[PDB]
């Protein structure tokens, strides 16, 4: 169905070092395809998925010039933000920027976003209209004024609504074999007690892509969440994901419970049940 | 494909 292209930027000040650490990564959906690290020797934007390796040298010079230019802007941001909040020159601070566009199952534009955070907290963000700004506090208001005066929303809207989608679509085609694949979860149940009256049933989903998934425990066909624990979805390291959900049941009652697995990668939901 | 050529400073 729907898709995303997102860029994540992190920049960390290091008083006593020559420069901030700048890290940038790009994703299409749940798949990372580029990175840049200011401390790495290449001083280059680098490929991280097989499909972008296809791009010619112009693409790579352009992408490396732009990320380097981004790192410079974040470097001055760290210094001006430090002044705005009257912070000591001795501490490490952080700036983070995230932007991207969403596209529907018809691959046409849904949504754009462009957000900025200082020390892990919202600083300034482009609203849904892509014409105005939301500013968290008064330091950010000064910035909003400046960015409004400079017509910055306008630039980003042209990119978010046009260029971003155009490239996302191009990536979807060129990486279709992996970006447009879907890997069904492989599933199983696991069983463990405590002494007498209690036991734990744990339902596993392994090797699935994309990462969105719903794991539901029912007792007697009744959607019941009371005492149900879902671990955060986790990367396998090979491009797929894993997740489990557990219930702690009165022991003897194990046969009543059922695990439901939903994933666009499989044609109908699965039901698993403890069988010994 | 990154936005560019660059972004304004805070």
């Amino acid at each position, epitope marked *: 169905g729907s898709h995303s292209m997102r860029y994540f930027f992190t920049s960390v000040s290091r008083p006593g070092r020559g420069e901030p650490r700048f890290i940038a990564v790009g994703y299409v959906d749940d798949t990372q395809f580029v990175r840049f690290d200011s401390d790495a020797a290449s001083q280059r934007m680098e490929p991280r998925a097989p499909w972008i390796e296809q791009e010619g040298p112009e693409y790579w010079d352009g992408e490396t010039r732009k990320v380097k230019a981004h790192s410079q802007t974040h470097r001055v941001d760290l210094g001006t933000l430090r002044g705005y909040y009257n912070q000591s020159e001795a501490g490490s601070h952080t700036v983070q920027r995230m932007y991207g566009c969403d596209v529907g199952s018809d691959w046409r534009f849904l949504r754009g976003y462009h957000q900025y955070a200082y020390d892990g907290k919202d600083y300034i963000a482009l609203k849904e209209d892509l014409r105005s700004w939301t500013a968290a506090d008064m330091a950010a208001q000064t910035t909003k004024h400046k960015w409004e*005066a*400079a*017509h*910055v929303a306008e*630039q980003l809207r042209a990119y978010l609504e046009g260029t971003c989608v155009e490239w996302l679509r191009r990536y979807l085609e060129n990486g279709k074999e992996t970006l447009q694949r879907t890997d069904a979860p492989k599933t199983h149940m696991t069983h463990h007690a405590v002494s007498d009256h209690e036991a734990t049933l744990r339902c596993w989903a392994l090797s699935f892509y994309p990462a969105e998934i719903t794991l539901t425990w029912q007792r007697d066909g009744e959607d019941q969440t009371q005492d149900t624990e879902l671990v955060e979805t986790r990367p396998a390291g090979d491009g797929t994901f894993q997740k489990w959900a557990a219930v702690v049941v009165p022991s003897g009652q194990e046969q009543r419970y059922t695990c439901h697995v939903q994933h666009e990668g499989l044609p109908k939901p699965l039901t698993l049940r403890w069988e010994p | 494909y990154l936005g560019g*050529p660059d972004f304004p*400073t805070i």
Partner: T-cell receptor
Amino acid sequence: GVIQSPRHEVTEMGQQVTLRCKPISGHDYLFWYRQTMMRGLELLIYFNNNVPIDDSGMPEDRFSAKMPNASFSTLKIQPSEPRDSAVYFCASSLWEKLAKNIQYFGAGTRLSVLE
Amino acid sequence: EVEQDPGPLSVPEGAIVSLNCTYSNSAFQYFMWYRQYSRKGPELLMYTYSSGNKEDGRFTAQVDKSSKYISLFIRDSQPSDSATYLCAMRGDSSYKLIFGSGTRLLVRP
């Protein structure tokens, strides 16, 4: 405005040539261009916050540009050759002027490198 | 590659003048016309994002991105419009401008 020096240079080939530019204070982008007579400008390099960002138009061999601080850039040719004769312009700008493709130009340096 | 007709244009005062440029790379998104008096730096006249028409006094700039063809019209031309006119362009990954070679315009008083 942007101050470039020298205004005129006439030199023999073989010499080192140093061209200088002071951007307008507060501007944080600096561009160096070259124009050969009866033709157009071509970008040699530009800088942002004193860091070279694009130098694709810089000749492979005898040309070198620097920006030691926000108020000063140099472009060096060593050794100079007659084909380097040209007018060299320096320009500076800010992000918001660059979004409207506005740039402030020095008066240029007119360079004749003679045999 | 920006292709521009050099060849001196000589027109009588009051005439409409038409200058234009062709290019080859479809990633150019910003298009500019500069004027330059003999022995001086270039002065921005007009700038276009997209395809389209912008008017400003006696000047109109246009962009046809599918023909890869851009133009500037100057109505009711004046002696002080005598100058070399350069078009310039770029895309979105660098502030580097690519210039055409320029067209010399003489407007006879």
